[PDB]
Amino acid sequence: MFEARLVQGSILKKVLEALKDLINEACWDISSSGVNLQSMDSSHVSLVQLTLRSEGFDTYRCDRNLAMGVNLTSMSKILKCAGNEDIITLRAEDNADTLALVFEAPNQEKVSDYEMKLMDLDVEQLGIPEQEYSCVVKMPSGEFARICRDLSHIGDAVVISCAKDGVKFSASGELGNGNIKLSQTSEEEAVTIEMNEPVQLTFALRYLNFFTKATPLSSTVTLSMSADVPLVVEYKIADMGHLKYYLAPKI
Amino acid sequence: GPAMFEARLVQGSILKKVLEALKDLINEACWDISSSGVNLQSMDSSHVSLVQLTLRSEGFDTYRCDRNLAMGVNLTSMSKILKCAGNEDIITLRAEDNADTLALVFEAPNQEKVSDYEMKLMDLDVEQLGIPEQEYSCVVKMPSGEFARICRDLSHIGDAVVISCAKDGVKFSASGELGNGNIKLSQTSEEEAVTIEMNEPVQLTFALRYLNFFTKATPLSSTVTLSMSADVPLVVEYKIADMGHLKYYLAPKI
Amino acid sequence: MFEARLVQGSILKKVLEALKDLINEACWDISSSGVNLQSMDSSHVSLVQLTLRSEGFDTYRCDRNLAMGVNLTSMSKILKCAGNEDIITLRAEDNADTLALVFEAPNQEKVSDYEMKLMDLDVEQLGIPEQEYSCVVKMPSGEFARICRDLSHIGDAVVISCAKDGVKFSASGELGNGNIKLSQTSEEEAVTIEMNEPVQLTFALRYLNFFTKATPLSSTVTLSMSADVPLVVEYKIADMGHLKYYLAPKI
Amino acid sequence: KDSKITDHFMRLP
Amino acid sequence: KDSKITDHFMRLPK
Amino acid sequence: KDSKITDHFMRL
């Protein structure tokens, strides 16, 4: 029997929105440490890895590991039926055929509760190595969201370049080309590079516009680049975990 | 010679809201004008639901009807016409007895502007229905937005809602391929409240497709009242502040 | 060679928004006095004429004439990548192959930098002399847009009638007909009618609903009418110029 | 599966 | 029934 | 051409 209570259920609502359009079905690795998801998209150009730690939940009790196969469209529909101030509670039992969700509005009169069928999945899990990165930018998520959306009208691939003065996003297409340069500043909506060596990777813009649907989870996004390694787009989830998107360069 | 029928409504948005509540559920309908007010009744083309509108003459700011008239109106064409009115306009209906057209006049309250439209009517034969008076097993009075949310949320879970009612609260439920869920309201202690008057426990099943048409009337009222008894249609009622009401009727299943 | 600077660049974004859908591609004539553009639409039923004076930019300098053929949708795409309070700058040199756009944020951390492929056009410029019009009416632009939009729900042609007291727009279709009458008043919300003799003309409404895209450029619109001649819907661009749409009448 | 509304209300004239 | 705007304005040359 | 995520991370 697994039962986790999270007062700020909006987090769980926001998480499904970030994922549902990129990956359709995924396995939810429940454990005594917390929740973990990892999956590739169907092209396997990108990978998303989710971490919710048991310390973040207001109440957590997991007696044995479960690997719940979820349809993320189906789960998103159920989370839609939850107000953004609802205290969400998850609950399953070890012979897992259904996952139970319980929404309570914090005025105490309304109590929804749903029940979602699982499915059979086999995760092609992957090994994510520990490594320092050549360049790590930490900028506002709003702006990074607009950079990627805007440049996608010029061309379908971004060139992101990085030096200790500022970072610059560029792209090209049939109609022309354009660049965007942002510098470091002088906390919340600021830009700070922790740079070690210059980098000039490019990434397909299609995917980062899926990634940036995670913007409601944090004011800040952090980028991580080295040559010939996958880029890491990181949205922290406050005092609880993170959501990491991995994007393979082209070369 | 004076108009056979002339009515002046200061809060003309009421008539804009009524036409959104209707146009998507029923396209053609019959407006019955008399000295006592306006009355319209129609089934949707599946004969599964029914709407009944009632605007008393007391509610208008000027009402005079010399003869009983029955105007066949394409509610879409009517809706287009009153979309052309501001939300604080003064709306005036006007008709000559054997009406070939209905006259609408939109007066802005600042006095800058005066629009007037004239709508062709059509020939229809209504199949009018007898609705008896009765006292219902269960009567819930919840806020209308809450009701509109529940019907829309549950409708992605499944095709049909089970409404069940005791005097602790009401429960809405549905199920489909992806799973199932249930929503439970309980009573309180103003217009965001939920009260029940209750004489015998109720549990019927209703097609949600229809209930999401009924909620187009949500702008008319903060509250909505639901009336249920075994094997008789559900009554979703929207009050039209001190003027009348708009009632949707929906038959249960099997 | 040519270098203009516009501090309130919302202006240039709005001008493109008000032209991209009526006219795909036009010629931009740049000179020392300012920008001048004239174009018909594809049907040759309407014509647009833009005028932006050098006096209105913050720094203007054009050493010689230049006939930039621009795709206006592709220009609108690029223009959307600027914020509403960005300081835009235009740049081009002798026989321009491309036009340069520079968007600067006013917080000064961001500098976007696009470059637009121009194209080859030979324009059919037309002679528009001065003339006085039997009726000119000055009303709010939001109203005239509201009226042209609503009347198209009724019928696909409008009858504008101006006389000594007020102006009347009218339409009629399969579902019925309607009239809208405005009268003189007693700044931004004022109707005024310069009447020389009565007018009653008929215009296709679908063209007018393109013209109304210029509504963000001014609180006010002025209609100019005489018998047997094109109507003139004109939106002034503050302290800088104007945008005028010419719409031929019906037969 | 749906009862029609004419199965609860009587048609007039 | 829409008149062309070239019926009210003449073309200026080269 | 895009490169893939499975060319950088390996099946565990």
GROMACS .gro file of C-alpha atoms in nm, chain A residues 143 147 150-151 153-154 174-183, chain C residues 74 77-78 80-82 109-118:
model
   32
  143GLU     CA    1   1.250   3.466  -2.141
  147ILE     CA    2   1.348   3.297  -2.712
  150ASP     CA    3   1.022   3.342  -3.141
  151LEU     CA    4   1.323   3.185  -3.313
  153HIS     CA    5   0.936   3.140  -3.671
  154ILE     CA    6   1.275   3.209  -3.833
  174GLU     CA    7   1.429   3.079  -4.593
  175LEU     CA    8   1.314   3.427  -4.487
  176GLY     CA    9   1.633   3.543  -4.314
  177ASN     CA   10   1.809   3.497  -3.981
  178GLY     CA   11   1.846   3.655  -3.638
  179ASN     CA   12   2.038   3.653  -3.311
  180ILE     CA   13   1.950   3.727  -2.947
  181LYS     CA   14   2.221   3.819  -2.693
  182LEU     CA   15   2.173   3.840  -2.314
  183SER     CA   16   2.440   3.932  -2.060
  579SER     CA   17   0.798   3.756  -4.329
  582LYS     CA   18   0.709   3.734  -3.835
  583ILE     CA   19   1.038   3.908  -3.755
  585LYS     CA   20   0.674   3.985  -3.354
  586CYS     CA   21   1.011   3.895  -3.199
  587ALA     CA   22   1.035   4.249  -3.058
  614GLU     CA   23   2.035   4.337  -2.098
  615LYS     CA   24   1.895   4.211  -2.431
  616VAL     CA   25   1.977   4.290  -2.793
  617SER     CA   26   1.801   4.100  -3.072
  618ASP     CA   27   1.940   4.124  -3.423
  619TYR     CA   28   1.754   3.999  -3.732
  620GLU     CA   29   1.818   4.026  -4.106
  621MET     CA   30   1.541   3.994  -4.365
  622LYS     CA   31   1.568   3.862  -4.721
  623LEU     CA   32   1.425   4.124  -4.957
   0.00000   0.00000   0.00000
